[PDB]
Symmetry: C4
Subunit: 388 residues, 4 copies
């Protein structure tokens, strides 16, 4: 049920939800120098200068990437159910994924990801990241946590991400469902929970003890769950609803639970739109898969692509456009806002007069589908700038 | 008339109708394991585990396909006014339809479908399906029913579908119009009636004795009636209006008349959206014409294409992507949700917390045109996943 | 001003107008056999079985086409300011226009159309059409009428069309403006006036003595006025507003002034949508330029293309798909509703239960942008049916 | 905050903003001869017959273009932070920009635009334009004005444009922010200020002493700021809001500050739409870069493309379609409304009955996305007229 009830037909209503591509940000009463724009966020006791997290996807984050992201002031999450924990040396496996043709990568991944997880590799990945001075953030599905959460705790990871395509505090197992309250209470580190798109679920995740909530179902560049299942709420609406839960939970308890907008982001402008709708940080995959150091070798695939029965992701060719440093902090060599993402955030905040991220969440927004079309006929035809 | 009156101009109003591509499904309060999702539906006394019916189209269903579908838990309808009853061996005819060029198939079909129906073949198709252990479901137009309904009864078909592009209980013949009340009373088997898109007509079809109602005018992949006639209501709105008639008819009489969303479905997500708007089952053609066993040999054409005066269908090349087994129950080798349709339904129901089809009809819906665009720039450009 | 005031910005409002491609027709309470559908309309004392008028465009109507259309039960208008009155032999000129390349036709037409009008040819075209048994309908611009209206009267044309891109009863000349009241009173034949898109103007044209009003600014397939000037109201809204003026004028005076929806029509479905919004007949150009007998030799150009200072039309390649008989009354060999237009109207009226054109004007309409997209992915990709 | 609050999600609202491509103009009560349409505007004491200003962009305006535009009754602005002030002979530089490939121009421009500004060239450009009989209009960014405003005054420029992507009267420097009140008071010539898109900012710019306000953030054909930053309000809404500020400032003080719609204009129709929403004149770049005399050699690039850290523009290929005379006053050789822009304005005003620009600002507007799609299937497919 909802307080908004557009009529689909007799006895069936809906509410309008707006996508990243439908909104735009409006200047306020003042501008400010981009150098003054404060972009920090915080999860648990970990402060970060860059409000960006690399998705737990095998084309995006390996141990080296996690360290490079940590040194730049950002974060990267290693997926503990991917190739990194199933193979001692993932590089030959990543080589095969990148070289196979378009009609074959699904069947290949279904085979390669069938190799059983080695619990010892969970520990090693955590420890080799930390030994190199990086923040060790790792992800598990709810089922994975029931099996490997204690391994993560004993290894001493800095952050645990429990991430399912759609998560709730209430799950009807066929089997004991994962008790998220117990998990957050028992794990020695902060626990991030996702994904959701509704006020109701995000609030319950916060009440369960979440250190942050991941918002987004299916917006990702390599994700097909929306086509396979028909499930999803566009990001601006999802982010705003979950930010409202954050603010109500803060009022109730005094505890601040950051909201992370997860997926569907290509440009710095996409990031800024997500912050304006309430996000404290963003989780992105495809923009970082384009880094020279990315394990995907120019490819980027969803972690549900290898499902043996029902793939819900695909493998796309994103290419390689620069170093992870250039992508995050520049200098930008490109015209499309996919490099120097931090500089884009600070520049946008400057034009809008937002001194820090909380002020950025307060900027006025317009519904403006023409933002991406007005005057862009040449760019679209010639695949330049906003038309690439 | 309608209770909603958007203004087109002075003295002309309209109501907004929403298409499959305009909506999305929102998670509820709980998730559940897909293995617990009950996907059954029932028409007459026939229960089916898969809520899918193959359209009565010559590229989709022949006798073998009808048996294969029944064995898997679904249904297939043989069109008794197509080539199956006009030719003892349809295979050479299907060969010609598939081999001729784009500028020639209309004229060819106008000729081939002029071969008179052989009443003995009506009996033969029904009985050869049943002798092989399949459920024999057959379709006729209203005019066809006035001539051949008794032949279908004498042959002992399990289900009769009366299907016109647009049907009503009230028809002004130039001829005696088909009395649908008498037909349903006199036929010894359940009679499905369609097609319609309004509460008013669907309710009258139920009062006439329909075992089910087919909803949809022109959404089909090989249909051109919307361009030829300008008639149609997008599916979510039509389904909801007709589901409302079902619920009112149930309150009035205690009899449940399932609503079948007919046409325009490509992916598992499209199916789930139709159920969420009130459908008890779906009738699909093009997704099954892509089966290796489909008689269309990779082509799919509307059964109004052969009209000698005004074709209202076309012949499209849908290709061959897998076996009918793979398409309906998997395992899925593809990234786009066109295989393992049953698995997609159960997985979607799982993410939404819908234990059975009735609960699925209650899931919250958003108007979200961005569901199909957010983040999908690569998929569209490379024709992968949702961009194919 | 208007009673609908959507906000563009502070102090600037607007009203929503809907295009042909945004609406669809909804079945009513009954269906009827297409053979019973009465499609007649009437202008002056001239009854026509086919409610279609061929546009006064040099690629569409010459003397032969005007006769062929009259014989089939329709009408064709000869433009008295085009090639037909500037050259004794238009065929070599039409050959050149159709034979020159895309980058050259503007300059060529600017040259060719500078040849002065020969008033004697006005008489000749009218008289040769009538001598062949055809209805002689001719068009002039308002300025043209001030110079040649008496020639048309002396020649004895059956119908006079006064047509400007945008006409009003009130025009500020630099020159004596055309007195439309006097024109209609003095002309011995019915005078059709256009074009307009508003209730206010159409009502004044009616009060001035119009036998019919032409509705439409810029929807045409070979028209660019909307891009050059930014002026226009989409057809459904324009038709409905002008139909309301017709109904009010009828109440005031008892005189019925038919509303003609002019331009932007490709298929029979487009015609039916225009009738449903209030049109008594349609004026179409591009569908008839596709006739084997069309003077355009497969090309179709706007009559403002030859402007020596500011072209407001272009030349498109529409091809040649059949005889004018096939296009209007079939039998249709095509799958896209561009042939057997009369059969399409009658079939559509049948599905909607409309016994005559007045009933067709009462059919329910939905705002349904998805009408043209639902399920049409294959047709669009393969350029078949609705995707051509 | 705003008086319109569409809901994005709980606790986040927005207002609908409409783009140029979403609106259309409606005829009024009368038409008038285009020769009677008064298109004049005025800034300071400078009256101009053509309400068009060439953008301060290096592909659009050099000294020759500025003179040619002035002679025709328009204006051209020289960007004093581009190559015209960094190189004594810009031609070899313009040659290089036009010769490099798509993947190379960003890096090249970052290098070429790093050449320091030569203050003596500021004087030279201004005075050589005036010596040739042209009106010398020049642009600076706010930071540039703090350094070179006195140089412009000493040189005796006719108009000074202070232009930033987003400007406000309130700017938080890291440094003394530019005092716009002092600037306008101390400069001996009129000072135009921009850019903005809100009533609040434009009103303050007027109160600071602006001779005109530039409206627009990111609509330009060679701009990517909307993608890089996510900031922008579509032009019709921005123009109307800022025109409302003009009218209130006029009521307050009796001083008229013209509103200039800046960017995103391709055709005469786009111009007319902007005037109808309140603009007193338009600033355009890409349509004038297509002139034979344009310094871009057929290319057109944003002046933020050369940013060494975060480019916010791109280089597009606009080609060369005619002389600047043909583009502005015709005769038009093209079918798409990109030539004879003045004739298009007067013709549009004629169809609408607008005797002067103030009446044009009062024309009725419809929200009509179908203006650019209705009937245009051929034009789009064949890239003719409105489909190029
Ligand atoms: O439906 C899905 N199937 C998948 O296979 C999949 N893999 C990743 N994700 C989610 O997408 C996010 C990455 O989005 P981008 O690539 O656009 O950053 C990630 O951060 C996840 O939230 C998936 N969603
Ligand atoms: O207007 C029409 N003209 C035709 O020739 C035609 N043939 C099939 N159908 C209908 O389309 C449904 C199949 O749609 P899909 O191929 O999208 O499943 C089918 O189940 C039918 O409802 C037609 N509709
Ligand atoms: O703006 C315009 N510039 C032109 O050059 C032009 N030529 C024809 N017309 C109008 O278009 C109608 C024909 O439209 P179709 O080809 O789509 O039928 C015709 O019936 C006219 O109303 C023009 N409109
Ligand atoms: O965001 C931006 N980055 C740039 O690099 C840039 N360069 C020009 N402009 C603005 O665009 C206007 C020209 O627009 P058109 O080429 O569409 O006329 C100009 O008049 C400016 O207002 C820019 N905006």
């Amino acid at each position: 049920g909802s307080h908004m009830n557009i009529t689909i037909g007799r006895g069936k209503t809906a509410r309008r939800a707006y996508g990243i591509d439908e909104i735009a940000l409006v200047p306020g009463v003042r501008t400010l120098d981009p150098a003054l724009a404060d972009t920090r966020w915080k999860v648990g006791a970990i402060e970060r200068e860059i409000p960006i997290i690399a998705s737990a996807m095998d084309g995006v984050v390996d141990s080296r990437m996690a360290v490079l992201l940590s040194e730049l002031g950002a974060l990267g999450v290693v997926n503990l159910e991917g190739i990194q924990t199933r193979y001692e040396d993932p590089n030959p496996i990543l080589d095969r994924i990148a070289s196979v043709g378009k009609t074959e990568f699904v069947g290949l991944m279904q085979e390669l990801y069938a190799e059983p997880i080695k619990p010892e590799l969970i520990t090693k990945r955590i420890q080799e990241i930390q030994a190199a001075g990086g923040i060790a953030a790792v992800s598990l599905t709810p089922v994975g946590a029931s099996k490997y959460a204690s391994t993560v705790a004993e290894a001493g990871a800095d952050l645990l991400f429990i991430q399912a395509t759609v998560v709730s505090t209430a799950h009807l197992s066929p089997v004991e469902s994962l008790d998220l309250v117990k998990l957050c209470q028992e794990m020695p580190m902060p626990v991030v929970l996702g994904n959701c798109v509704t006020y109701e679920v995000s609030l319950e995740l916060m009440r369960a003890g979440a250190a942050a909530v991941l918002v987004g179902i299916g917006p990702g560049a390599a994700c097909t769950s929306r086509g396979v299942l028909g499930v999803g709420v566009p990001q601006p609406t999802a982010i705003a609803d979950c930010a409202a839960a954050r603010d109500d939970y803060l009022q109730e308890t005094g505890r601040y639970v950051p909201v992370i907008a997860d997926g569907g982001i290509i440009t710095g402008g996409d990031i800024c739109k997500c912050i304006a709708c309430g996000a404290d940080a963003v989780m992105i995959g495809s923009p970082i898969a384009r880094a020279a150091e990315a394990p995907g070798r120019g490819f980027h695939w969803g972690m549900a692509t290898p499902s043996p029965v029902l793939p819900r992701g695909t493998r796309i060719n994103v290419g390689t456009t620069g170093t992870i440093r250039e992508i995050l902090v520049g200098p930008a060599k490109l015209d499309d806002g996919t490099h120097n993402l931090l500089g884009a955030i600070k520049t946008s905040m400057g034009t809008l007069g937002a001194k820090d991220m909380k002020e950025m969440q307060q900027v006025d927004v317009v519904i403006a589908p023409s933002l991406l079309t007005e005057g862009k006929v040449y760019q679209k035809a010639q695949q330049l700038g906003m038309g690439k």
